[PDB]
Amino acid sequence: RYRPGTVALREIRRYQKSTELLIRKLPFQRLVREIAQDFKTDLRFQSSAVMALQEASEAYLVALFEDTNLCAIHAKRVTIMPKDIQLARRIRGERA
Amino acid sequence: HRYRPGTVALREIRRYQKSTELLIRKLPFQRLVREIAQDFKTDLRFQSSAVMALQEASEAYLVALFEDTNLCAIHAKRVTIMPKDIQLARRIRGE
């Protein structure tokens, strides 16, 4: 058995070295179609459009999680909490 | 008679959020602007409107930064703002 925090560090090292997408493609495409259904009906999506949306979303989420980690470390903690995400979004000017 | 600590601070907070004047003296800021610009060009003249615009922009930027710093300090279950809060706010903002 491995003590907690070792497998997490191994995963951090592994996922920071690879470039592959971390979200399954079909569920993300389904979510994108569901969201776009509101603005217009009977819409067609190119594969490149869905790929670009996925890449942009993943990059945005990774940057947000980096800022959230900084916020959590500031409060003398290791565990990410929703208040850290809210503070990062408020400071960046998204929810302000 | 003596007010307990934090009362005059709140009174000043309420007073300075109702006014619209400039909180930095004009002559020291003008001298600082001229000294800073001296490093780029020699014998440079400044319009009064340019110095006023610089002062307004600097004051607005500092007020926004202090608001973000206060938010950061409150997040850490504290009341006193510290340079770590300023650094964290600047890092998050992208500066």
Next chain:
Amino acid sequence: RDNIQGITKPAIRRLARRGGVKRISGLIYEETRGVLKVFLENVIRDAVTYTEHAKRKTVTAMDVVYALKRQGRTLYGFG
């Protein structure tokens, strides 16, 4: 259709691990899903507006690229 749940907990965990996060609380998955939904809604609305102006029924990659660029999120590699 509740496809917003398609973004699973391991996927969010992987995204956080890529960002350097060591420990994750169990109450942040909903927040991440909401943030992702908001971002996708904004970008897709802009892309659909761009498509509608061009009198088309297909959302091309160029429309998404323009929508991302107009929000200060320029994306390289798709045109």
Next chain:
Amino acid sequence: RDNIQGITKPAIRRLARRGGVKRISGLIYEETRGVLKVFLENVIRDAVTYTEHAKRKTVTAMDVVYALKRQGRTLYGFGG
């Protein structure tokens, strides 16, 4: 000329008070002075570049407004 000390401690305290800060540490003032100096250096460098391109010798308000717009801090009130 050490004019960075012209931004006195009461002035920084007032600026913090306008921002809603109740208690201020003693080391805040130096960091605030450094941040202000960096911001002023950037804006003034851009304004001086704009002035030099025009073959002038006076930094007008239009140059400062254009520099602020370039940095993403559009200012209303001076020029257009």
Next chain:
Amino acid sequence: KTRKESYAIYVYKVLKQVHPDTGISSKAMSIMNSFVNDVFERIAGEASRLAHYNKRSTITSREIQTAVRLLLPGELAKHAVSEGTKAVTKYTSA
């Protein structure tokens, strides 16, 4: 002296239409002029980009409408769009 065009009289006319018994200072007038110029520049630039994207070389009311919908947020945009139509149709009637 060289004349300086500005959105001074028009803002005052709009203010008199809205608030018949209220004046406006010089600094507020300058702020209003800067705001009008900024919004004009933003909308015109968005319309130009839209025209360039579709390989067209003419700015029409459709480009302005799409730029307004893209820039102005929420209900504002909708109202603005209506106003735009409410003008153009009238301009066609005369």
Next chain:
Amino acid sequence: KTRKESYAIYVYKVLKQVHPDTGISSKAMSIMNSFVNDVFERIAGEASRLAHYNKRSTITSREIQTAVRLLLPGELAKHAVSEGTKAVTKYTSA
């Protein structure tokens, strides 16, 4: 089956100048082409704004030089300026 101009051959020529024994993939080519287009658009737009500010109808070498100085950060900008100047000088010689 239509012509689609791109900065593909020139990027390959520059790469062969820099790394004669290193290849480049298609995704990297697309990224490089997008980067070139973005930088060109940025510099041209800044030069156009500079020309409009000074009531000038012509984009010259001075406008491009000032735009490069304003946009590119740090010593990079300086180096770029040098290159451009040299090119212009050469183009004047022949």
Next chain:
Amino acid sequence: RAKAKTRSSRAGLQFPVGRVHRLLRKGNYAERVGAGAPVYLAAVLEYLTAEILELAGNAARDNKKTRIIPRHLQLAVRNDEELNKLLGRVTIAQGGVLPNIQSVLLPK
């Protein structure tokens, strides 16, 4: 020759359609400018100006003043969510800040 009447009067506006058309033509925006674009732009600008001026006048009346100052404009802009979003990255001179204090700092 028929008596000249301005285009703004034809469209029932207060902003100048002709000046906007000239600015669009001389602004190096596109090779050609349609006849309906200036009317649309003038209508949008007039609507936005009327909205912000109405809000500022309401604030000034609530402040027992009969003249508009930049403080009133700042209050009108910041108190409206849509206008605040539109002018999120804009600094208004002599505007001040919106009065608020965090609930943590208030005494119990």
Next chain:
Amino acid sequence: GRALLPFDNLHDDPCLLTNRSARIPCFLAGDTRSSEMPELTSMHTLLLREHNRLATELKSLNPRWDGERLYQEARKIVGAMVQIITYRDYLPLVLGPTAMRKYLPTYRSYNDSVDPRIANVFTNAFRYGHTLIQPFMFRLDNRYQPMEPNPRVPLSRVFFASWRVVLEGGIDPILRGLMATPAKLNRQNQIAVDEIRERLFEQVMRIGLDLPALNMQRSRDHGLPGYNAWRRFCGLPQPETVGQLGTVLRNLKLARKLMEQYGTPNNIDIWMGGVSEPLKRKGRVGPLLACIIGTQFRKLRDGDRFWWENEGVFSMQQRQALAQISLPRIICDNTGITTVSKNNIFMSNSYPRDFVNCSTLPALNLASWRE
């Protein structure tokens, strides 16, 4: 060959008393006041015809459904159409863009913590329409020209007169007159016409009635507060003296008359204060009436679970099909009319400046209703 409203049987008919020779009792509908003038009867008949045509089309599209399902579906579509037309065309022209944006923001979802009941003050604050009544009724022929006999009819002779719609060419001339006649602009010195003020129900009643006086009397009977209380309720400043009242109303003579009548702004009736305030920009009501009406309609929209924009109520394709509906399209698709006004029918009142041949406008696509 087009359907009309069914007749009604009552113990006493104050509506047959207008014409003893015709012997034509007026109609029955969802409201007992549907025969005040031929215009209201024409509107109710048009709505009934639209419901019948929609039911016929739905039955033709889907024959498996029973009659009850057909009736319920037609009723649902008619209600959604009425809500769409109202909240998309009428209220923006009443409140004005600023008031509409302030009191009616974008719809989000149904809220169960808001009150959908009608406030008591709304039964008076909504009487502003009493200031938009033209003194005469206009009927036009197929060419929008004055149709004979009686191209213009006094309003004192058209009250409770159903015989003027069954025996006078139907409802098409009435609709043409409604669609191609400017309304009455409300001015401070011109509040309401004398036809409704001195010759209201002259034939039916022994003596005429005073509509504004009835409005004030009903406001007093309901025990509604004064002008100042409602001004303070909406956040507007409260006048106290003659000068303050004149400043608020932007008029001195009318303020002097009000002061000489009541003596204090707190005693001013709600209706008079609402209709005496200067109109908003591109609006038809004062700030107080706009506040009350916007609040009431926002409460109605938020608290309605069957709102057409609410999820589950309609499908996305059904919502797209419904979003293209318009009043001129319905007025063309349910009667013999052949020329209607442009979009925003409430604004177009000049022929033929803004009238279309109504052969190019889209129809209501019901292809998404297949089971």
Next chain:
Amino acid sequence: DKYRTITGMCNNRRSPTLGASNRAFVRWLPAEYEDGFSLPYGWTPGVKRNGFPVALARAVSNEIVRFPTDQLTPDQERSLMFMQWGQLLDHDLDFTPEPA
């Protein structure tokens, strides 16, 4: 819950009677009466409201609302469509029954 009820009841789960028919109105402000309970102002002669005599409604409409008909100004942006749809919507919304 599939279809609306004619009487309008049960629309709100917390209070089915909310928004139904034949129910009392909603008072956004407390009602005012001369006796304070149920007597509308003007019923009893000699009463003074807010320290002032109660003005007669008929006179108020007589010398203020009245105006010469020949000076009627038509609306250049509205039509009878406005008033007709307003009356129809009001007839949809509310109705106060009164004793015969």
Next chain:
DNA sequence: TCGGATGTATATATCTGACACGTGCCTGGAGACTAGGGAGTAATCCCCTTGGCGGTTAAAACGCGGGGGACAGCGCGTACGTGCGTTTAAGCGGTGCTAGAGCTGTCTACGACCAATTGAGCGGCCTCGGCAC
């Protein structure tokens, strides 16, 4: 838990400076007319997007155990807010000088605009090895 001290919003003069008009004029917007290239409709063409099926298996779910951060409580000691007295240049005026920003006039040379020419680059076609298994 009622009374003293202080801070502050408010009502009443008082002078002032800047804002809303008034007037002159000049140049940029409107009225016409002509000419040509942008694009709005139609008519194909094929391509690439959606839908469906089947087998594999890799990732998502779920339950259990434990140990390690999160949060609460408790000294403590120190440093920052609050007055209070003592320097100190900031702001306000008035004055004087000249640096350079703006305007006028002329001229000249340089970029847009024509046309004929030809070759640079794009598309389609093979072809072999760098690399993901």
Next chain:
DNA sequence: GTGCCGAGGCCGCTCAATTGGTCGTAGACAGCTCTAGCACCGCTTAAACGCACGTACGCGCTGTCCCCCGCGTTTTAACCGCCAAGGGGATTACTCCCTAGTCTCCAGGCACGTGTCAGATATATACATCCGA
């Protein structure tokens, strides 16, 4: 170790760059004005600058407990490979409104000058609030 699909090198055109005049306007000079930026001095005096107290807050030091991580098993749907239709992006041509370009006139909107009335500034007052007993 191993094949294979992707990056790399070759032909055929054809649609832009290039060479070669023309010209008319944008910009680069020189002159001259006069506005405003710089500098200098004297006086208040409001601001800043030290100094001492002590009180509340930042900061370590236990304690526990519950929640998140790690692992094993059954379960689910992503994913790859393949087929068949057909909606609808891309091209083409063919004009036809629609808009650019030019005189000519005027009025709309600039600048310049003025007087009066919102508004900032004393001053006493009546609240509104805070720390204490």
